[PDB]
Design a binder for this molecule. Sequence first.
Ligand SMILES: Nc1ncnc2c1ncn2[C@@H]1O[C@H](COP(=O)(O)O)[C@@H](O)[C@H]1O
Ligand SMILES: Nc1ncnc2c1ncn2[C@@H]1O[C@H](COP(=O)(O)O)[C@@H](O)[C@H]1O
Ligand SMILES: [Fe+3]
Ligand SMILES: [Fe+3]
Ligand SMILES: [Mn+2]
Ligand SMILES: [Mn+2]
Lengths: 250, 250
Amino acid sequence: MTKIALLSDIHGNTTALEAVLADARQLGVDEYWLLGDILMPGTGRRRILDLLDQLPITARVLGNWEDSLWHGVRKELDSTRPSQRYLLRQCQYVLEEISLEEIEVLHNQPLQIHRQFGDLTVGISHHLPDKNWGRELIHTGKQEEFDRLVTHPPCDIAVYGHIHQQLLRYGTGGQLIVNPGSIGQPFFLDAQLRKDLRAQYMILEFDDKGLVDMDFRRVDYDVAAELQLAKDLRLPYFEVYYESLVNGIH
Amino acid sequence: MTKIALLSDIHGNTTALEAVLADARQLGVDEYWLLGDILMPGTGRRRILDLLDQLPITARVLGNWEDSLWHGVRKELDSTRPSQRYLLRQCQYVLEEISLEEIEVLHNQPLQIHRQFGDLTVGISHHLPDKNWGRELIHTGKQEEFDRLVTHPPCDIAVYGHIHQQLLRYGTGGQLIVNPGSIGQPFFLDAQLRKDLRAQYMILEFDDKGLVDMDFRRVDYDVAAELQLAKDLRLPYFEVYYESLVNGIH
Ligand SMILES: Nc1ncnc2c1ncn2[C@@H]1O[C@H](COP(=O)(O)O)[C@@H](O)[C@H]1O
Ligand SMILES: Nc1ncnc2c1ncn2[C@@H]1O[C@H](COP(=O)(O)O)[C@@H](O)[C@H]1O
Ligand SMILES: [Fe+3]
Ligand SMILES: [Fe+3]
Ligand SMILES: [Mn+2]
Ligand SMILES: [Mn+2]
């Protein structure tokens, strides 16, 4: 048996990540897959990289926020655009602790990879195989777009992140498509589900017979402590971070 | 915490049910929801109703195969169709151990029910809220149809069965939609996934903060023993049953 924790869309949420990593340790997870969006707009910098360095990471792919950080530290952002001004300040926050060499490692990652478990081929990407940004694979996405995860090249099970929602659905040909949701910025369109903003992740378990378990988990973490950490570290756009962690509005 | 086991699409598969029930009991499950398609075309008759009698079943909805059984024993099936002569023979088999009065109880079940857990309303149905048969909610079903599970009347989380596939997706408004899959007749369109025909069910765990876990489980059972039982009982259409359990073709 191999027990795999899918970690995605941490977004610098130090407290959520630590709680998810402790939950996974308790469950006796054997390996970790990192789907990307590691840093920003949350508190975590050095502490996030150190926690991941302690992990048996057997699969890793590039999120769009790794590209955004890369552009930011290379002075390609224009603050006259509100969205870039926001990103730039986040990059500046990150640059207080994280070097350019470490950012280079964060950026030097494949868009898509594959792993094999007996008869089963698993595809892994942040979003689309060739495109780690966009809205193609949202909850109401076209079947055509979802089929891209599992064909050309084929797999039996695709795992992705990016949409910040937990998911188990299918390619046209019956291939599994799974999403662990977001560790640091869980996303709900439903206002009742939104009252619960615990960290999201998932466990896959493979054994000699095939895929034996898909566990979509929620992990409690100390929100008040994360926000106190944001204040103390002078995290930019406190009120935006606050609203996403407390009210789940983005 | 309340830990709920969703049991769907048993289809008379005695050995698969016994295995799922032992897995559930080991997990400390607090209650069981029965999504329908209890009997036929598998082996279990009295044994299935006995096993379900020993459980804390807090929710139960009508499956289309319950309707079929009721119409079958009342000679209301269409003899001009091959599929319905197959069905009639399954009904006659069931009738050997099960009384007309029990079939009436099986048939007198609601199509859809609702349960509340704190802030969350859970909708429960075999297929569609007002239609327990057809192909509307297959893996590639139209979003308009899925939205019927979660609106008019509204709920935050709909659970259904009928398609014999595990599912976690969303209504247009972000409402959860889940499917435990089939205990007795797991259905795969993907050949590699089809190599593993373990029983499917799922666990929902609710706590003080909301839905904390969605665990989509596979349960190993002794297929050889179930097929030997089918022979010993003179189950009709042994070769169809064999195909369904060994090769996964329906
Ligand atoms: N269906 C959707 N409608 C609107 N926004 C969405 C949807 N799905 C995901 N998002 C947003 O996209 C964000 C994740 O993208 P990223 O910027 O790559 O972290 C989520 O946190 C949401 O705010
Ligand atoms: N996407 C699909 N394409 C073809 N057949 C399906 C699909 N989804 C479910 N089914 C069939 O419908 C059956 C369940 O319906 P029921 O007759 O109510 O047990 C499954 O055993 C499958 O054989
Ligand atoms: Fe993200
Ligand atoms: Fe069924
Ligand atoms: Mn992303
Ligand atoms: Mn059915």
